[PDB]
Every structure is written in structure tokens, then in C-alpha cells.
Amino acid sequence: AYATQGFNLDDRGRRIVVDPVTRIEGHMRCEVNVDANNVIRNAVSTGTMWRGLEVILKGRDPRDAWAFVERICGVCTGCHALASVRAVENALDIRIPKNAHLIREIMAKTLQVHDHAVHFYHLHALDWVDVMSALKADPKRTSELQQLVSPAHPLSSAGYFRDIQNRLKRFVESGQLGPFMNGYWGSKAYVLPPEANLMAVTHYLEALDLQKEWVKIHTIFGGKNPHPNYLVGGVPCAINLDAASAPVNMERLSFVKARIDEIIEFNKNVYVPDVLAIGTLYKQAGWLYGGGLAATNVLDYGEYPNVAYNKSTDQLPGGAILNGNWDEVFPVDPRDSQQVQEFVSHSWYKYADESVGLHPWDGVTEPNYVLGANTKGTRTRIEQIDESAKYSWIKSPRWRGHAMEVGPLSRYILAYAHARSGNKYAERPKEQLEYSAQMINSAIPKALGLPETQYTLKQLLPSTIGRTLARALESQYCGEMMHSDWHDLVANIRAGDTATANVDKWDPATWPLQAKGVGTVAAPRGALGHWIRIKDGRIENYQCVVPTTWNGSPRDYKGQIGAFEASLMNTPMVNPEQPVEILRTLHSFDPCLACSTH
Amino acid sequence: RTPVLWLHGLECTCCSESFIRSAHPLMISLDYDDTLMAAAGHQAEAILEEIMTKYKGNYILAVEGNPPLNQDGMSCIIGGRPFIEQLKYVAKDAKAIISWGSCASWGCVQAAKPNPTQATPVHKVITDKPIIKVPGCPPIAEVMTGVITYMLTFDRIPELDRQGRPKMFYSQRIHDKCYRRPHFDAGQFVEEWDDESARKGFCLYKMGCKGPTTYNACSTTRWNEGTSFPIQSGHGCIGCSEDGFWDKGSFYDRLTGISQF
Numbered sequence: 001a002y003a004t005q006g007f008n009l010d011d012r013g014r015r016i017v018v019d020p021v022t023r024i025e026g027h028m029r030c031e032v033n034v035d036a037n038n039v040i041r042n043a044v045s046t047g048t049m050w051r052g053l054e055v056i057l058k059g060r061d062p063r064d065a066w067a068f069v070e071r072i073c074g075v076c077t078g079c080h081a082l083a084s085v086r087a088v089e090n091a092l093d094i095r096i097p098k099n100a101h102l103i104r105e106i107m108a109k110t111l112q113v114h115d116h117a118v119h120f121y122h123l124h125a126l127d128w129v130d131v132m133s134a135l136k137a138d139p140k141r142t143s144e145l146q147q148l149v150s151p152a153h154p155l156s157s158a159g160y161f162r163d164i165q166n167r168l169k170r171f172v173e174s175g176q177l178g179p180f181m182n183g184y185w186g187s188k189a190y191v192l193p194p195e196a197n198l199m200a201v202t203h204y205l206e207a208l209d210l211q212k213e214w215v216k217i218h219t220i221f222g223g224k225n226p227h228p229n230y231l232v233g234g235v236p237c238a239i240n241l242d243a244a245s246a247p248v249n250m251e252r253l254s255f256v257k258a259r260i261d262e263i264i265e266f267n268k269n270v271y272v273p274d275v276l277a278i279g280t281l282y283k284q285a286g287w288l289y290g291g292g293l294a295a296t297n298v299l300d301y302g303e304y305p306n307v308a309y310n311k312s313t314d315q316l317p318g319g320a321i322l323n324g325n326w327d328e329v330f331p332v333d334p335r336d337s338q339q340v341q342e343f344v345s346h347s348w349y350k351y352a353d354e355s356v357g358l359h360p361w362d363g364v365t366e367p368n369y370v371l372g373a374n375t376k377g378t379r380t381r382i383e384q385i386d387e388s389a390k391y392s393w394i395k396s397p398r399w400r401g402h403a404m405e406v407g408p409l410s411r412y413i414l415a416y417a418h419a420r421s422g423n424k425y426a427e428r429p430k431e432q433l434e435y436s437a438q439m440i441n442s443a444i445p446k447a448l449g450l451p452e453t454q455y456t457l458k459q460l461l462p463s464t465i466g467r468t469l470a471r472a473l474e475s476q477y478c479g480e481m482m483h484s485d486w487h488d489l490v491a492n493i494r495a496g497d498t499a500t501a502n503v504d505k506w507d508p509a510t511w512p513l514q515a516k517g518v519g520t521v522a523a524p525r526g527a528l529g530h531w532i533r534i535k536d537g538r539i540e541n542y543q544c545v546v547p548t549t550w551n552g553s554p555r556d557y558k559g560q561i562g563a564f565e566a567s568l569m570n571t572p573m574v575n576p577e578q579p580v581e582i583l584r585t586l587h588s589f590d591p592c593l594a595c596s597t598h
Numbered sequence: 599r600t601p602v603l604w605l606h607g608l609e610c611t612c613c614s615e616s617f618i619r620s621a622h623p624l625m626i627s628l629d630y631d632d633t634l635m636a637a638a639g640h641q642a643e644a645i646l647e648e649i650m651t652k653y654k655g656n657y658i659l660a661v662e663g664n665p666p667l668n669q670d671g672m673s674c675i676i677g678g679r680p681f682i683e684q685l686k687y688v689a690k691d692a693k694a695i696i697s698w699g700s701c702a703s704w705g706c707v708q709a710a711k712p713n714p715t716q717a718t719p720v721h722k723v724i725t726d727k728p729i730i731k732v733p734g735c736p737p738i739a740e741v742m743t744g745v746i747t748y749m750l751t752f753d754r755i756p757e758l759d760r761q762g763r764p765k766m767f768y769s770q771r772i773h774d775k776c777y778r779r780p781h782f783d784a785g786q787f788v789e790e791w792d793d794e795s796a797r798k799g800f801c802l803y804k805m806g807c808k809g810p811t812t813y814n815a816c817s818t819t820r821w822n823e824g825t826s827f828p829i830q831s832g833h834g835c836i837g838c839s840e841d842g843f844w845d846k847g848s849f850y851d852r853l854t855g856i857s858q859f
């Protein structure tokens with residue numbers, strides 16, 4: 001047993017293993033220990049895959065790098081391409097034209113919406129929603145609930161809900177339950193009434209239908225989704241407004257705006273209201289577990305500047321908060337060797353000296369798969385992993401030595417802190433947060449006949465509910481932003497600026513003989529960076545530190561735990577053989593394990 | 599009905615994401631897919647084993663990603679064991695095996711030089727089963743659903759080319775019906791990004807387009823319900839459906855001997 005970051009870790013209790021963790025991207029194992037009353041007292045995050053993409057890049061052309069690193073992940077597709085082109089542009093002192101900037105921002109914000117909404121409905125919802133209880137719902141009373149939760153949503157009739165319920169009952173009676181087979185349905189961990197469950201299942205189906213339209217924005221600008229094309233120096237999608245021969249003309253831009261408008265409707269009428277409703281009911285049940293590090297230490301690089309290349313105009317302004325002091329946002333510099341560092345003390349890699357964290361410009365990725373002395377099982381048949389030694393393919397990133405949570409919640413905490421200190425670019429997330437708190441505390445309880453509560457944003461936000469809420473709010477904000485970006489794009493083109501690529505430094509004969517650069521992105525899951533060194537036209541070093549690397553990290557040299565492990569601590573389980581609460585909290589980070597290990 | 603069991607090795611999950619973009623069709627009992635299942639851990643593992651017994655030699659195994667042979671196979675761990683062990687176990691009683699995407703078909707990005715995990719395509723590990731390769735990074739959504747639909751309608755694998763790819767989707771090179779072909783035929787090329795030629799949609803050969811040596815349905819079926827494809831949106835094909843495309847030189851280096859095409 002030992003104490004770290006206010007958490008009293010203890011492994012003497014009953015060990016529980018979850019391998020595979022399902023409804024994530026990629027491969028993860030989780031182990032916990034519970035006390036005599038089934039409360040988690042120890043938690044162990046293991047990334048169970050590695051591909052070695054950083055080493056594969058060595059010796060290749062920096063201009064090709066984006067396509068390789070894009071294949072780190074097909075879920076957060078393109079965010080690695082963006083980080084890569086930004087890193088190469090930073091190394092080579094390349095400034096992209098306005099239209100390329102706006103198109104990249106539209107693509108980024110489209111990914112944010114798609115990733116957030118599909119995650120919630122496709123992967124997260126079943127941790128909160130009992131699908132078998134939806135079968136016991138009254139279609140009339142489900143229709144009445146839909147009017148209270150979101151009056152503007154047109155899909156609301158009793159008959160609409162009744163038809164959905166029948167096809168669910170048919171699928172269920174078939175005997176082929178498919179993805180619902182052997183679920184944890186009927187656990188006391190589920191608290192929603194039948195009508196709220198049927199409503200959620202219905203919106204699941206709407207989300208899965210509509211998500212294929214949203215990504216057509218990537219297809220226009222980038223050729224395909226997943227894995228749209230990017231370009232060092234700009235975008236490949238050249239413009240000619242008024243002709244059908246260029247990649248982008250007015251008709252294609254009108255198509256993009258139609259897709260954006262659809263996104264705005266879905267976020268405000270379906271997604272945000274559902275999360276507010278589910279959040280309220282779980283708050284009423286007292287389920288405010290899962291805060292972990294969000295209560296103390298959060299980080300994001302900052303993103304979406306109003307004015308290209310002017311970080312003071314970031315619409316999701318970043319930095320670092322420590323010790324839960326929201327009145328003091330520290331600035332974060334990706335270039336500073338004493339700020340972002342990665343340890344491998346408890347990871348399956350080796351450094352010359354593993355008591356030191358390496359800034360990614362000096363990063364090293366040399367595998368070392370070895371299991372500690374206290375392992376139960378063998379090298380190829382693990383029964384119980386030994387977290388006192390090396391236990392994950394994920395490295396351990398820290399900021400000035402501190403363990404941080406990253407992601408939409410971190411961004412929303414940072415935005416709120418910035419707004420409090422006078423920042424005028426964070427007004428919208430602040431408004432969203434205050435609206436959401438009033439709904440969760442007062443308006444929704446009033447409408448459902450529940451007691452009003454008085455939780456502050458400082459109490460609500462650092463929780464699994466809060467982490468889920470911030471994602472939905474971020475989706476809404478991203479759709480609003482890209483709607484504005486679209487207008488600015490069309491206005492700039494109509495005024496006569498059609499430029500999409502700066503090719504002045506395309507030829508490697510123009511490059512400095514050595515250079516280093518960093519590109520950062522506010523990716524869906526948090527703070528993404530790519531650090532590159534270029535020597536004689538080739539990649540000399542390429543290191544990625546990815547949001548799920550931060551959140552899913554194993555312990556560091558000092559033994560400090562990362563966000564996943566912290567978030568599971570101190571949580572009761574209804575039934576230690578059913579990982580309902582573990583999955584609910586882990587899924588609130590939207591874990592991407594391929595991203596985490598690359 | 600024939601169940602489809604979907605396994606995941608070393609992968610980025612693009613093929614799974616592509617599959618859910620299909621418009622036509624939007625049939626199976628997807629009784630195992632780790633990315634979708636309600637159950638986790640031991641309960642997910644148990645679901646897998648019940649289906650294999652009940653439908654012996656009458657389920658389809660679909661594989662996304664690939665197995666690593668380095669690190670004693672523990673660079674991809676499922677249920678505390680190497681992925682290759684799960685792959686071989688499930689393959690043994692499958693009626694047919696689908697290798698989704700370039701990862702399962704050939705290796706894809708993790709198999710690019712120097713391949714630190716010795717990632718190996720499915721057909722090099724499973725050698726005694728009917729396999730179909732569906733390459734691409736990822737494949738087109740309608741190609742993936744088209745393959746499954748054929749197999750479920752007809753209870754057999756469709757006609758394959760010598761490389762194991764379905765002729766119904768991989769018989770043509772991109773360059774055969776690419777809409778920029780008349781420009782290629784007239785010597786009309788982009789030379790620099792966003793040049794006048796690029797704004798007129800001229801051929802991308804001199805910008806590195808690998809369409810002339812790449813078999814896929816991208817120029818006709820196109821992507822995301824026929825919205826666009828790489829070339830239409832202005833970037834050359836990078837060859838993503840062809841074996842070893844990451845190690846065929848820079849994506850921006852042109853093919854040699856233009857007259858061949």
C-alpha cells in the first residue's frame with residue numbers, strides 16, 4: 001500500500017480483471033482491487049497493443065509523414081495528419097494560406113462532432129441505458145418524455161417510439177442478441193426508468209444513420225473518410241467557384257454547409273439534451289464518482305484561434321491547472337524541455353536512465369516486453385498483471401512532473417477558468433456550462449418532479465457525469481464554430497482569394513539542413529502533439545504524445561497514477577463480477593488504445 | 599443464418615469505421631465484435647466460445663488488423679494471451695475467412711520498414727482455410743458490405759484474382775476510368791500544388807498519383823455514397839489497396855515510364 005496524489009492505493013483486497021475492455025478502440029486490460037465492501041482501492045491500466053509507428057517514420061520524407069501517422073487511428077481520423085503537417089510547417093517556417101487554415105479547421109471540427117456523438121451513442125450509452133428495460137416502456141409516456149427533454153426534436157410521436165420498440169423486441173426474441181448477448185441488464189447500477197431507456201435506444205439509431213452524412217465534409221475536402229488526405233503547406237482541394245473542374249466550387253461548398261446545418265440540429269436537439277437528462281438522473285441517484293485527476297490537474301495545449309497563428313485568440317484556450325486552483329492557469333509550452341516529458345519506468349520500453357522523463361524531441365521508443373516477479377501466470381498467459389513492474393505499452397507523459405487529465409472536460413474547465421480571469425474568447429463554453437448546471441440542478445428536476453439541487457460547477461464537473469457532459473457541450477460548440485468558419489471561407493473566396501497551398505518550401509532544396517518542429521492539436525480525446533527533427537531532407541526523430549497516452553498512462557518514476565487509474569479509485573461496485581461502473585468511468589474518457597501506443 | 603465473428607489484431611480501426619459508412623446496404627448475427635459488445639472481459643470471451651460450438655464450420659470469421667510475431671506475440675494481447683492464439687483458435691472451425699483491409703490482407707502501416715512487431719498478414723498464419731482479401735486503407739464501405747452480402751446470399755466466396763481479391767471490386771485500376779484520364783491522355787498535368795492546372799483539375803501523375811498501378815473501385819464507386827475520391831478532391835492516389843504501398847517510395851514521386859499507361 002502507498003499514498004499518492006491524495007489517493008490511498010491498496011492491493012490487499014479482492015482482485016478483479018477485465019480483459020478485453022470492450023466498447024473502446026483498440027486493446028486494453030484493466031485490473032482493480034476492491035475492499036470488503038466492494039469499493040475500488042487500486043486500479044491498473046494496461047495498453048495491450050503496440051505497432052511502433054515512431055520508428056517506422058525514421059529516414060522517410062517529412063512531406064509523406066502525415067499519411068503514415070494518420071494511420072495511428074481510424075476513429076480520430078485526420079487529427080494525426082493535422083498534427084504532422086503542422087509540425088513539418090513549424091520546422092520549415094511555412095505559413096499556410098487562409099483558405100487552407102479554414103478548411104483544416106472545418107475538417108477538425110467535423111471530426112470532433114462525429115467522434116463525440118458516435119462515441120456517446122455507439123460506445124458509452126449502454127453503460128447508462130438498460131436496453132432490456134426499454135422493452136417495458138410505454139410508447140405514449142416515452143413520447144411525453146421526448147417533449148420534456150427536447151421539444152424542438154420533430155421525431156416524437158407515440159407511434160414512432162412504438163415501431164422502434166417492436167423491432168427491438170423482434171431482434172430480442174430471435175435468440176440472436178448479437179452485441180447485446182450476456183449484457184449486465186437489470187443491475188441496480190442502472191437507474192433510468194423504461195421510457196428514458198427507449199428514448200436513448202431510439203436516438204442510438206438516429207445517430208448511426210446520420211453519422212454517415214456528417215463525414216461527407218471530410219470526403220469533399222479530403223477525398224475519403226476514414227483517412228482523408230492532407231498536405232504540407234495547405235490543402236489539396238483547389239478552388240474555382242464559378243467551375244466543376246476544380247475540387248472545390250460553390251456547389252461543393254453549399255453541400256458542406258447543408259451538412260453543417262444538420263450537425264447543428266443534432267447536437268442541440270438530440271445529443272446535448274440526452275446527456276443533460278441522463279446526467280440529471282444519475283446525479284439524483286448520487287453517482288458523482290469518477291472525478292480522478294479532473295478535481296486537481298488538467299491540461300490542454302489550446303486550440304481554434306480566431307486569427308490564424310495568434311494563440312491569444314484561441315476559442316478553447318488552454319494551459320494547465322494544478323491542485324484544483326481554477327484561479328491560476330499556467331501557460332503550457334510544447335517546446336520547453338522541462339514541461340512535457342514521458343517516463344517509461346512502468347512501461348514496456350527501455351531508456352538509458354528510467355529515473356528521467358524525456359521531452360519528445362529527445363524521445364526514445366525501444367521495446368522491452370518483460371513481466372515482474374509478482375505476476376500470476378506466464379509471459380504469454382497473464383492471469384494477474386504485476387503493476388509494481390512494467391505493465392503497459394503506454395508511456396507515462398507528465399507536465400513539469402505532474403500527472404494531468406486531458407480531454408473535453410479539461411478544455412471546459414480551462415475555458416471556465418479563463419473566462420473567470422477576463423478572457424473574452426471563452427464566453428460560449430462558459431454560457432454552455434452555466435446553462436447545463438441550471439438544467440441539471442433545477443429545470444430538469446422541476447420538469448420530472450425531483451428535488452432541486454445546488455451543485456456548483458466545481459462539484460459537478462470533476463466526475464464521470466461531468467466528463468460525459470463536457471464532451472457533448474464541446475460537440476455543440478465545434479458545430480457552431482465551423483458554421484462561422486464556413487461563412488468566413490466563402491467570403492474570403494468571393495472577395496478574390498482562392499489560394500489553398502503555399503509551395504515556396506515544397507522542394508527540399510529550400511530547407512534548412514537541420515530543423516525541429518512541433519505540431520499540437522486539440523484532438524477529440526485531449527492534448528495531441530507530434531515532435532519532429534529533420535536532417536538532410538529526412539526524418540531524424542518523430543515522437544507522438546497522444547491524448548490517451550496521457551489519460552491511460554501507467555505509473556511514473558515517483559509512482560504517481562494517471563487519469564484512468566485515478567478515476568476508478570474510491571468507486572463502489574454493485575457486483576464485483578459485473579464491471580458496469582468500471583466501464584462507465586473508463587468509457588467517459590473515450591479511450592483510443594491504438595492512439596495511446598502508436 | 600450464418601453468424602459473422604469480427605476479430606481485431608494490430609489495427610487503427612479504419613475498416614470498422616468504413617463498414618458503418620455504407621449506404622447500400624446500411625442479414626448477419628454479429629455475435630462478436632469487441633468494439634460493440636455490451637459484455638466485457640470474461641463475459642465477452644464466453645460469448646465467443648458458445649457461437650463456435652453451435653455453428654461449427656458454419657460461421658464466417660472476419661479479421662481486421664494483423665498478428666505480430668515479435669515480443670512473443672504480446673505486442674497484441676487479448677485475455678492475457680497473444681492475439682495469434684485467438685486468431686488460430688477462431689479460424690480452426692470457420693466456414694470462410696475475410697481479411698478486411700490492408701492490415702489483414704498484406705500488413706499495412708505497422709508492416710512498413712522496419713516492422714518492429716513483425717506484423718504478418720492473416721493468410722501467412724492461416725494456411726488451411728478459404729480466405730478472401732479485401733484490401734485498402736480502409737476499403738470502400740460499399741466494397742466491404744458488398745463482399746459480406748455476396749457471401750451471405752450465395753454461401754460461398756466470390757471469384758478471386760490471383761492475389762485473392764474479389765474480381766467484382768478489384769478488377770480495374772483507378773486509372774482505367776479516372777475522370778482526369780482525358781487530361782492524362784492530352785499531357786495535361788499539375789506540376790505544383792495549387793497551380794493553374796490544379797485549379798482546372800489536371801491529371802495528378804506528376805504529383806505522384808499511383809492510380810495507374812492500383813486496383814480498386816475508387817474512380818467509379820467512389821467514397822461515402824459516391825461523394826468523392828482522393829483524386830477528385832485533389833490528391834493523387836497513394837496506392838493504399840496494393841501490397842507494400844508504404845515502401846514504394848515517396849507518395850509524391852511520380853511513377854517511371856509514363857508511356858506504359
Ligand code: SF4
Nearest residue numbers: 776779801802807809
Ligand atoms: S494518373 Fe491519377 S489523376 Fe491522372 S488519370 Fe491516372 S488515376 Fe487519374
Ligand code: F3S
Nearest residue numbers: 814816835836837838
Ligand atoms: S489511395 Fe486508396 S482510397 Fe482509392 S484512390 Fe488510391 S486506392
Ligand SMILES: [Cl-]
Nearest residue numbers: 704706841842
Ligand atoms: Cl500493405
Ligand SMILES: [Mg+2]
Nearest residue numbers: 395543544545
Ligand atoms: Mg509516443
